[PDB]
Each structure stands twice: as C-alpha cells, then as structure tokens.
Structure 1
Amino acid sequence: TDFLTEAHLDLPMEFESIGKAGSRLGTALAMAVDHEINMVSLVRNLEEFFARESCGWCTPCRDGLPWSVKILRALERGEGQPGDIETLEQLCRFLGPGKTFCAHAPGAVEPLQSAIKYFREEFEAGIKQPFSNTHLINGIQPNLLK
C-alpha cells in the first residue's frame, strides 16, 4: 500500500476514504515509520522483497523490479546517478494496473511512488555521481551528446 503522512492520520479506515487519499485500505493493519528510519532504505527493503517474490511470468515485474532494486541500492550507498529517480517514476507508470499480468507489481510500485511523492528529498540526496554507462575505448571518439 501507498505511504501516508501525518496529515492523513485523521481519516476513517474505510475502503473509499483511503482510496480517495491516494492509497488503499488493504488488510487494515497499519505500520508506523518514525523519523529514524531512512525512507530510501525502507523502500529498498520493500522492493527487494517484492522483486524476489515475483513469480517470473511477466516482463515488467520480473525485469523492472530488479532494476528499481539496484537503483535503490545505489541510492542507499550514495552511488545514485541522474535519471535514476526518473527511471523509478517510469517504472511506477509502466508497472501499474493492466500493464502486468497480475496485481503483485502495482502493489510493489505503490510504496515506491508514494515515498517519492512525499519524501523526494531523501531520494535526491542519494544522487552524487555523474551518469556514466560507457567506458572510453581507445581509438574511437565518443558521440558527445549534449
């Protein structure tokens, strides 16, 4: 389920009330996160669980949850690069309902997108390194894209 802030604490535990707040009632067993817990590490743990519990049937969950896991691992260690949060948002958009074979992957990307929506300063703090995907090959001048 999507993370909610302290402002949403004054809301009745109904399906329609939590549905209009941008989350789900779910099993109605709420979990509280304090100020000590880093949101990036918590979302990394959640996505690690969700990626290793994929059944492997369909491409977006099976091949995109490990990408989000690796991005969150890099953000945890301060090895984040530009475009990582954009990749996480694209994964949120493209792992929604109707795009995967079952509802496991929309539930996987709900906490990631809610924590990005509410705690974006913690995810942006992990991006330190410049984006690098290639190494230099001697004798070939790279296409310097601007």
Structure 2
Amino acid sequence: GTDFLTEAHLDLPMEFESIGKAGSRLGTALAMAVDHEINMVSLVRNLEEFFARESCGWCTPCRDGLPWSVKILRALERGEGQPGDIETLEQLCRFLGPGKTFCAHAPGAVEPLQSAIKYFREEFEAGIKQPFSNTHLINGIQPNLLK
C-alpha cells in the first residue's frame, strides 16, 4: 500500500513522520523486500492487478484508471509499449491522489506506481518498443497526420 524506497532510505527509523518526509508512509509497518532479479514492471503490474480487481465499484477514477494502468503495465511487460504510456501513468498517479477519489484505496494503489516511475524509470522506458498507433486506416479517408 506504501511506496518503494531505495537503499538510502533503509537507515531511517520506522516511524510515521520519519518515513513521511521521505516521500512515503509507514503503513502497517510490515516491510516488503524486492531483490535485483525481479523486474519492477511485473511487480507493479501484479500490484495494479490486485488493486484493480479488488477495488469496489463506487467511484470513477479508481474504477476506470486502475484497469488502464493494468493494461499499460501488461504492454510494458510484453514489450508492446507505445510512446505516451509513462506520461499517462504519471498523470494517472497525479489524478488518483488523496481527495480526487471517494476513498483512500486509489492513493495507496498508485503510490507504488509513483515510486516505480520515480526510482526505476529505465525499465519502464525499456518496456516501450513499438510506436504509437491508436487509429487504423479507412482507405478512403486521408488521415490527419500531425507533426
């Protein structure tokens, strides 16, 4: 529910305020360790899959942004990432913070995404390989190709 920290934040005392100023929070004070052999993209994909499928169905942003994060992270897993996905995830994290949603499920969902983008950005960049293609041809209509 909390967000990832690096080795430099391992020396902080496990307190509410001490981890609060580190861009994080203490939470349930049960630490979760991730080693070097595990891709951050897959781990955050599993986190977002849990938060998407285990959320309630009340309010819009969690309901229709956590599956979008799940699909983006699956595309990053399979190497089918398109330019404009990491920025979409950052905007999603900024718009799923406290107060923007009905309850505090979504901020705790998007804190791991925020820390994964902030710290382990290079794997998310490496998940993008194929160019952006949302629309397909109609073969009788000239497309609005912009520069």
Task: For 1:42 and 1:135, locate their aligned partners in 2 and report how far apart those are by CA, in whole Å.
Answer: 32
Task: For 1:86 and 1:116, locate their aligned partners in 2 and report how far apart those are by CA, in whole Å.
Answer: 10
Deviation at 1:129, TM superposition (A): 0.4
Task: For 2:31 and 2:145, locate their aligned partners in 1 and report how far apart those are by CA, in whole Å.
Answer: 50
Residue in 2 aligned with 1:102? 103
Task: For 2:88 and 2:58, locate their aligned partners in 1 and report how far apart those are by CA, in whole Å.
Answer: 22
Task: For 2:97 and 2:30, locate their aligned partners in 1 and report how far apart those are by CA, in whole Å.
Answer: 23
Task: Look up the SS of the partner of 1:121 in the other structure.
Answer: helix
TM-score by length of 2: 0.98
Residue in 2 aligned with 1:35? 36
Task: For 1:12 and 1:71, locate their aligned partners in 2 and report how far apart those are by CA, in whole Å.
Answer: 35
**C-alpha RMSD of the superposition:** 0.4
Structure 1 gaps of 5+ residues are: none
Pairs aligned (count): 146
Task: Look up the SS of the partner of 1:23 in the other structure.
Answer: coil
Identity of aligned residues (%): 100
Deviation at 1:118, TM superposition (A): 0.2
Deviation at 1:54, TM superposition (A): 1.1
Structure 1, residues 58-114: CA drift from partner, whole Å, max 9, x if none?
Answer: 000000000000000000000000000000000000000000000000000000010
What are the equivalent positions in structure 2 for 1:108-119 lying under 5 Å apart? 108-119=109-120
Structure 1, residues 40-70: CA drift from partner, whole Å, max 9, x if none?
Answer: 0000000000000110100000000000000
Task: For 1:10 and 1:145, locate their aligned partners in 2 and report how far apart those are by CA, in whole Å.
Answer: 50
Deviation at 1:132, TM superposition (A): 0.2
Task: For 2:97 and 2:13, locate their aligned partners in 1 and report how far apart those are by CA, in whole Å.
Answer: 26
Deviation at 1:27, TM superposition (A): 0.5
Task: For 2:57 and 2:119, locate their aligned partners in 1 and report how far apart those are by CA, in whole Å.
Answer: 30
Structure 2 gaps of 5+ residues are: none
Task: For 1:96 and 1:145, locate their aligned partners in 2 and report how far apart those are by CA, in whole Å.
Answer: 33
What are the equivalent positions in structure 2 for 1:83-94 lying under 5 Å apart? 83-94=84-95
TM-score by length of 1: 0.99
